[model samples]
Target: PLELTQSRVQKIWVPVDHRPSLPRSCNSPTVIVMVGLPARGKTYISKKLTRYLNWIGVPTKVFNVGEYRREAVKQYSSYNFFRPDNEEAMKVRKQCALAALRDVKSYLAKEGGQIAVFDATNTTRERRHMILHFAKENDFKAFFIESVCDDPTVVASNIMEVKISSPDYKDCNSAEAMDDFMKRISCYEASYQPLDPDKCDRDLSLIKVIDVGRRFLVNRVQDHIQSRIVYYLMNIHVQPRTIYLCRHGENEHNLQGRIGGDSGLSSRGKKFASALSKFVEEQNLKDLRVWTSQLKSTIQTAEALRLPYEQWKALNEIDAGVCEELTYEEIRDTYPEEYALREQDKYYYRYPTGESYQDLVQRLEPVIMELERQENVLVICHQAVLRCLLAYFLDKSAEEMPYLKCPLHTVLKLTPVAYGCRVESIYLNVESVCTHRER
Candidate 1:
C-alpha cells in the first residue's frame, strides 16, 4: 500500500503482466483446464485471466497446448483430419496435452508460480480425467472452465479472424480456410461434452460460461483467487455495449498551462460540458452510469448532464505533490533533474514527492476492475487517468499507453467486440488549450 503524505488518496501496487510468481503460502498451485472448441474464446479469456491474476499479485502462466501439437506433429490438413476416427492425430494431441501438463508441474516446482492454465480443447471426459489425475498425483488443484457459444454469428466471426490464420490454414485461401474450419468445428460438435458436475468428481471446481456471458454456472469454486475470477466473469457479457470516455471539460488550469488543481471550468469548458450533455440526450443513452473523479472540475462537468453520478477517489488526477499547481517550465526550473528523469522514463518515473503513470495505473486498478463488471460507464476524469483506462481497454503497450491522445472536451466511445475493443472519438467542436507534450 502507498500512502500520500498530504492527500487522503490511497494506492496499492499491482504488477500487471509480470512474469509468473506467487507467495508460497498458497500451498498448492492451481491448474486451470480450458475446455472449449477452437475459436470459442478460450485463448482470449485465458489470456485475460492470466493478466488479471498477475495484476492482483498472483503469478499465473498460460500454457497453450496447440503450440506444442504444432511442434511435434507438423502434418496439416483440412477439417477431415480432426475427426474422432483420426486415431493417430488424436494420440498425438493427447501426447501434447500430457507434455504441457508435465511442463506445468515442473514450473510450479519453482518459486512463485501459483496458477497455470492449460489452453486446449479438452472436450472429452477421458481427456479431463487424465489432466485431473496428473494434478492430483502432483499435489495440484485442478479446475475446469468451459466456453460454450451457440451463436453462429459469433462463431463465424471468430473463425474468420482467428481460425483462418491458424497454422493448419496458413497456406490456404480465406474461402477454403473458413470451409475447413467450419468442418473442424463440426467434428468437435460431434464429441463436445459440456461439464456435468453430477457425473464428474464431487470435489471438482468448475465454471461454465455459455454464449459469452449471456449465462453461466459454477460449482465448488472454493479458492479465493478463483472466486474473484468467477465474480469478474459474472459481470462480463459479450453483448454489444458502448462505454463513453471523456476528460472533464477544460478548467482554469488549462488557460494557465497548469496541472492538477480544483480550478472551476472556463466559459468554453462549461459550454463543452453542456454540449456533452446534449450529445448524451440525443443519443438516448438510458440506464447510463456516470463515473467522475472526486474533483470539482469533473463534478461540475458532470452536473450539466443532470444524471446522478458516483464519485471515485481512485479516478483522481495524478498527485502532482509539491508541483501540484506549477507549469512544466516552473517544474523544470525548480526540479530540473526530476523533470529530465521523467522525460526519459515517463512510464516508471515517480515525480518528486508525487506519482508516476505507473503509480497512477496501480491506483486505478480497482476502478478498472469495477469498470469490467459494468455495462455503460461514462468516466469524466483527468487526462492521465483517462489515458490509463484507455490503455487497459485498448491493450496498448507501456511505451504507447501514456502518450495516447486524450484531448480536452472530446468523447471517446469504446465498443467491446469478440476479439478486441473498437474505439470511436467524437469531438465536441469546443475550442480549448493544448496541454499535450511530445515527450
Candidate 2:
C-alpha cells in the first residue's frame, strides 16, 4: 500500500481530439459530472457530448473513474487495485481515484476550453457538490448532468450493439458486460450522499450556479451594434467607411406611444427620416453601406440615405405577433402577465405571441459571422434590438444586455481588437423616443 493519506492524490488526465473555435463561447469553461445510478449510461452520454463538443470547437477532458482505475494500476504507477471489494483494497483504490481527480484538476486549471467532465457515477448530491467545490476553487463552471433512462434495459441492449471504440475506452469495457461489473459499482450507491444545500453549507463549498440567460442577451445585442461599428472603422480609408444605423423612422405607433406596427412613418417621423441624408452629408459619409432592418421606418431611413445599402432580416425588430400593433395601455390591460414579464427580464423574456432575445441571438449568429469575414458594413435597427447588437461588441455580460440602451439617431464608432473591443458614440442631433427601449 502506498503510504499516502487523503491529501496526496495525483492528478490524472486524458487528451481531447480538438479545441474550441469560438473563444467567446468557450471562455466560460465547465466541469460537468454525470450523477446517477449505476449502469446509467453516464459514460456513453459523456463520450457523445465529448465528441460533439470537440467537433463544434469545444475541447473536453473526461475522467471516467472506472476507466481510470481499470487501466492505471498495472501500467504506470506502483498502486495495485486488484480487488475492489476488500475494505483495505477499496480504500487503496479510493486513494488512487483521489489522485486521479487531483491530476484532472491540474490539467483543467491550465486555461482551456469548457473545462473538464468528471464522468464518474456522481449519483448522490454530496458527490456532485464535491465536484462543484473543486470546480469553484478553480474558477470553472461546476455543471451537473444527471443521466437516467426511464427504461433500465437501454444500457444492457446498447452496449452490445457497438463495435468501434476510441482509445480512451481501451481501459474500460463496453456496457454489454453489465452483469460482470456489479461489484465495481456497488459502493457508488451505498456510500453516496446527495449534494444538499445543508451539506454544501456544512462543507462551505463555493460552487455556484450562474444564470447565463441574462448575460447571453446582453452580449448578443452588444455584439451586433459593435459589429457594424467595427465593420465601418476597419476600412475607413478604403471607402470613407460611412456607417449609418437607422431604425425605420417612427410610425403612428410612435406618435401615440404604442408598442409595434407596420404603419408608415408618421408626418414627424418622415420629417425626421428625411434629415438622415443631410446628416450623412454633414458627416462626409457619402459612400457607406447603409444597413436597414426589414421594417417600414428602417427602409424609409435607408431610402432616405439613398446610398448603397442592404436589408438584413436580423436587423428587423422583435416580432409582436397578435400584439404586433397593440398600444401600451392595451398590453397592460389585456396581457398584463407578458407586460410584467417583459418589464422584469425583457432581455430574455419572450413576449406573448412574439419572438425573444434568445431567438434574436440565433438570427444574429449568421450576421455576426458575416460581419467577422466582411467589412465596411452598416446596421439599421430598432432601439430595443439595437441595444442587443451594441452590447455584443462591448463584451457585455448576459445580465446587462437586455437593459442596454441604444437610442435612435446616434452613431457608435467602434474599433475591434484581438481580445475585446472599444467604442465611441456620435449623437446625430436626433431626439430618440423611449417607450419600450432597452439597452
Candidate 3:
C-alpha cells in the first residue's frame, strides 16, 4: 500500500455557511483570475468571484493584471500584451500575471486556504504550468476553470467593458490585439489533463466512482439515506421499535490488550461471539438487517447471526496508527502526549499519530444514513465508535462520550419512536475476567 504521507485527512471545524466544500466532506479554497484580452470583460467576472469569496468570508484577494500594467512606467499602451512586434511586452504581461497569482497564494495561506482558481483564460498549458509549479512548490494546489463564450461578436458588440474603477479601458479599439488573441488561442496548447477523465467526473469532488460500482456498497449508502428519510418521515411510516448496537467480538487488539483498532476475535471474544449469536437466534429479530464494521471482529461476531450483514468503514474504530495493539497505559507511556490528548476529548480528539473522533464522525455519516434506511437493524461496532452512534440517538454531549456506559458483554438495541429511540440492552454470556493478567 502506498503510505499516505499526507494520509491523515484533517477535518477543520467550519461553520456551515462558511464551509468551502460539500456538507458531507472537507472543502478547498479558490484563486480568482481574470484572463482575457484587455477589455474582454475580466472585471465583470472578477467582481462576481470577489463577492462570492467574501460572502462566505473566505479570505481572498483579486489581483487584476490590468491594475499593475496600467501602473507600470514603461511600454504601457491601450494594448493586449500579446503582439508579434511586442514579444518582450507579452513576456512582461505573463510575469505580471504570475506575480498576481503569487501574491494571492500568500494571502490565501494566511487565511488557511483550500485551492486557488486562476480566473484568467487558461487556454495555454505553459502559463497553467507556471501556476501549477508555484502551487506544488508552496505545497498548495491549483485548478483550471475556463470561461469560454464562443461568439466573438458578443464580446466585440459589447466591447465597451466596465473599467472596474474607471472607463479607461486598456486594449480597447486595438484590432491588432484582438486578432493576436484569437491567433494565440488557435495556437494555444491545452495543458490540463485531470488524473484521468474517466477517473474524475464532476462528482469526484463529492463521491467515489468505484465505491458506487460495488453493489453492496451502493446498497449500504442507500440504506443509510433511507434511514434518514424514515426518521424525517416519522409520522408517515412505522418507526422502528427496536435497534441493536454492539461492537464485534474481541479483535486481535483486544486479545493483545489494545483499544481502538482492527482485530479478530480472541478465545474469550469467541465465546462472547457465540453467546451473541445465540442471543440473536433466540430473539428471532424479524426484519433484521445486520450492520457491522469492516473490521473482522464485528464480522466474526455476526458470523452466526445468519442475517444479511453490511460492513461499514464508518463503524471502524479510531485509528491506532502503527501501534494498533497498545493498551491505554501502554500508549500513555509509549506516546504519552497523544494518549492524554485522546482522553482529553475522546469524542473530538483523534488518536495521536492517528485520527480524532471528531473527524471519524464524518466517516460514520454514510453508516448513519444507511442505519436510518433499514429497520430492525443490528449494528455491531467498537466501544468509542459505538459511543458516537449512541450519542446521536441518545443526544449525549461531547463531554459524556468517553463515559457513556457501553458495557462490554451487552448489546444496545434501540427503536426509534415519535419522541426518540427506545433502547434495550441484551447481555451476552461471558466468563469473568477473560483477559490476560498484566505483570
Best model number under lDDT: 1
The most accurate candidate by TM-score is 1
lDDT (10s digit) by residue, model 1, range 73-109: 7867677667889898888878888898888988887
User: Which stretch of 10 consecutive residues in model 2 shows the poorest summed lDDT?
Assistant: 212-221
User: Which candidate, 1 or 3, has the higher TM-score?
Assistant: 1
The Cα local distance difference test for each model comes to: 0.83, 0.55, 0.55
Q: What residue runs in model 3 are displaced by over 4 Å at the alpha carbon?
A: 1-237, 432-439
Q: Which lDDT tens digits does candidate 3 get at residues 288-352?
A: 88888788888888886766888877788778665577776787788776655555555555553
TM per candidate comes to 0.77, 0.46, 0.46
What is residue 328's positional error in candidate 3, in angstroms? 1.9
Q: What is the C-alpha RMSD of each candidate to the true structure, in Å?
A: 6.4, 22.8, 19.7
Give me the overall lDDT of model 3.
0.55
